[model samples]
Target chain A: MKEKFVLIITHGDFGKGLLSGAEVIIGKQENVHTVGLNLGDNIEVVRKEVEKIIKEKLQEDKEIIIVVDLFGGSPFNIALSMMKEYDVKVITGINMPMLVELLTSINVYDTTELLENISKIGKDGIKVI
Target chain B: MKEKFVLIITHGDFGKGLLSGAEVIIGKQENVHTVGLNLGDNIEVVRKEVEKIIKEKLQEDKEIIIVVDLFGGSPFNIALSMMKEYDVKVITGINMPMLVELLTSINVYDTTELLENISKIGKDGIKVIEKSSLKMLEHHHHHH
Candidate 1:
């Protein structure tokens, strides 16, 4: 059986800090993966390397998901590039609320299922009024 | 009834990118919230403001969980400061594995139940490499 994975790529420790706050609510703490890319340090090279890893991970399973740190930046664009080559789902604009929703619902989903849930979670903070 | 909310904070868009990967596994898209803090812009003020929100959130519920991006930093410390007044759980070393585990199990568990599960999952990553593998399946065999 193919196992699933979550790839968390951040710019620095601060991003990690944000990820921690979000994860605390879900309360599980396992069955996920994390990677960090330092900014101003050849983001293009770093992105390609990370994509290679994602490709391999996806081949291991078709249900793998990739969450980048930005939308149009190197990380997000790089992840978007890999979508064509691999069976992976990617989401940008990460936050604690989004993470909580993802963590809470990831178990019962695949790439498509996860994306719909992720989109819904991403839309949560909107209309915060 | 007390309303619960999820807060996702990031220093920049890169952090947000990483979060997308983890949330995708959860299969849930509602009942969560988010905040983004810019760098070099008085994190203290930002922290204080966030703490206030957390405090208010806690006052609304006896069981409130606060997850920050790091430990021994402005955001985490700010969250820690409020701990004395409210009941919250703080975990460091945030990763996708940790995130997925937490999400998959969080709904079924409460404060105490969640903590125990968190610790167990954290430990699972240590003993079972699949729990910590870049290839997701590497760690899933013989482990939940």
Candidate 2:
């Protein structure tokens, strides 16, 4: 079985921030990469960056999952754009605890089940208290 | 009557970061503001800044709604403290969609009515891409 590779995409520096925060909690994670669609970055140009990473990972026999910050944003749309060509799974609203779960427990459950758990975990991370 | 305005305060850049995302989706926002607390900053100073901003918003005759990074964190704690002396509502675990929804619809619906829908938006945003989603979004890829 191939290893699960997480590709995080978000606005500004959020993907990087989430990566840093997740690493703070779970140590360094090597299999994950982030692509941030900052203000003024061209969509066409950013699309190629995502394309290159996805192409590179698919060639390396890695399981691909793109976790974006939110649904319908450019970063999420960019990942969705790749779905027609590559075999990549995408998830949105990636948070600290959810990213940590993906880094540590990808082998424990089905990709779908893992995502469901992580999605719920992301929601669970938010609270009024 | 004071119109509701959003004030985002988070542990790091998450506050402004989500604002950036929301702006990308909703265009530039004038009433929304952000304050980020980073390492090496004094806690009391940050608290003072928030108090000043809250006071200014109230002075401008706008209702203040503070969305914070995490519950019980300094930002939330500060925002929670404002509830006593000022007319402010604090929501924790701020996310992009929730902010976007708040900003875009704040004027459309009543303040409390708008807030009631945000927790679900924050939670609903955390979705895994499924096989059905691929086909659901397939048209975007097949553009002529």
Candidate 3:
């Protein structure tokens, strides 16, 4: 049996499908929530706040799956910093489809499974017809 | 009759006394709702999204008052651009006293009055004896 939580951190509004997946599937689930970050300006300020949220969540022995908006952007870079810590995982280039799957599946799997699912869905979510 | 709307834009969290004034008095007022911005990283996205919010809001007929967390910030610059249009106002160096007073008083004044009130309460809400300008100037910033 596994217990997990999801954290979706985007640089701006949850408008751009950042919150769609979670809201669609796990949005009503017990332990799923989102934190929106405004990296519109001031990287240092943004980094500190994000770091605090990360540190506090990790301290509680909670399994973290943070989905940032962009891959090489500042939000992703800061989230990436937490890989050295235990019970922490990060997935970037977040969109609606992957987020929904991860939130819906988090409680049933371990950290590794959560990470893999996030990656699989995040990658496969894109298709061109 | 004043017809102004107050928009509160904070950094990450609204806890650090930023929403205290507004929540105290004008929290439930007719036209005072806050928009929280996160400068947590990847500013380009933040800027574009925040810009979109501003553009959409400004297109409406309401008179405006904007309180931002930091001056010379991307959000500030984005907001400043909209200043060129009709029925728009912008104020920097935000805090609770200012936010509260503005919300409470916005609906009773014009754009100039709203701006003045925001600046007055924001400036006077600080005191060495009453609220401590030094302490306020020293340790007050929120992410929401």
Candidate 4:
């Protein structure tokens, strides 16, 4: 049985901030962690950190979902580069709506089903008024 | 002359985080500020603060662009509600790509063009690359 896990990776503190913001709306979430890539940090080191966490979670039979900030930016690119090695889903442009949706509904659906739905949720999170 | 300004309004510290993230890529930006609506924050209070900031910027002859985290969320709702009162444009789904583009291109394009471009950049920032696809891409990469 594979449990669901969300790994938020972003530039600077946005990942941690978004996780905190989501928790405020939907209480604390389980198996959700954040990785913040600060300025001047070496890319290889950050990539290894992400891999180590994901590998640790994989050993627990957890399905990984990495929510990243920018598409081609370092964090996203690092996650993308790891797709060949890990069976993970990487979602970019993370926001509060997506985070809250994932947190609240994590237990309701299976990994594949939630993966599709979460991407839509993340996309729908954006709006112009 | 009306200068352009960016207002980042989010559900919480994410707005501030994003501003700092963009600064890491593009250095510090001028006329850009963030408003984070934390838990237990009054919607009316946040709305007033947003309005006050916009009002002050407008008074300074600045064209304001408000970016929010979610569309129907509190911060976004407040920003949308003020659309009629203030001549500011409200954009939701703010991300680092959009912020960097907005900050770097603020002086190059007019407000209307910049708004359209920023939204596109934000939308294009989302990607889903499967492991199978990457293997195929890698195979192709080695051949070419």
Best by lDDT: 4
As a TM-score, model 3 comes out at 0.42
Q: What order do you get sorting by TM-score, best first? A: 4, 2, 1, 3
Candidate 4, residue B85: lDDT? 91
True contacts kept of each: 0.01, 0.41, 0.00, 0.56
Evaluated on chain A only, model 2 obtains a TM-score of 0.94
lDDT of 2 by residue, A1-129 (tens): 678788888887777766654554456788889788877899999999999998898889888888888888689779888866785888887765577778888878767778888887778877653
How accurate locally, in lDDT, is each candidate?
Answer: 0.53, 0.78, 0.51, 0.79
Residues B54-75 of candidate 1 have per-residue lDDT tens digits of 7666666634555544443455
For candidate 2, what is the lDDT?
Answer: 0.78
Candidate 4 yields a Cα-based lDDT of 0.79
DockQ of all predictions against the true structure, Cα-based: 0.05, 0.46, 0.02, 0.65
TM-score of model 1 vs. true structure: 0.46
Please tell me what DockQ candidate 3 reaches: 0.02
Looking at model 2 chain A, report the run of 10 residues with the lowest lDDT sum. Answer: A17-26
**Candidate 2, superposed: residue stretches over 4 Å from native:** A1-3, A11-31, A38-42, A59-61, A95-97, A100-110, A127-129, B139-144
| Chain B only, TM-score of each candidate | 0.66, 0.88, 0.67, 0.88
Q: Model 1 off-target regions past 4 Å?
A: A127-129, B1-144
Query: Residue-wise lDDT of candidate 3 within A68-114, one digit each (tens)?
Result: 54443455555655543333566654444455566666666776676
Q: Write the per-residue lDDT of candidate 4 for residues A1-129, one digit (tens) a residue.
A: 467888988888888778766776777777999888888899999999889998999899888888888866788778887676786877776666667777788888876667677667766666666
Identify the superior model by DockQ, candidate 1 or candidate 2: 2
Please report the candidate that would top DockQ against the real structure.
4
CAPRI-wise, candidate 2 is: acceptable
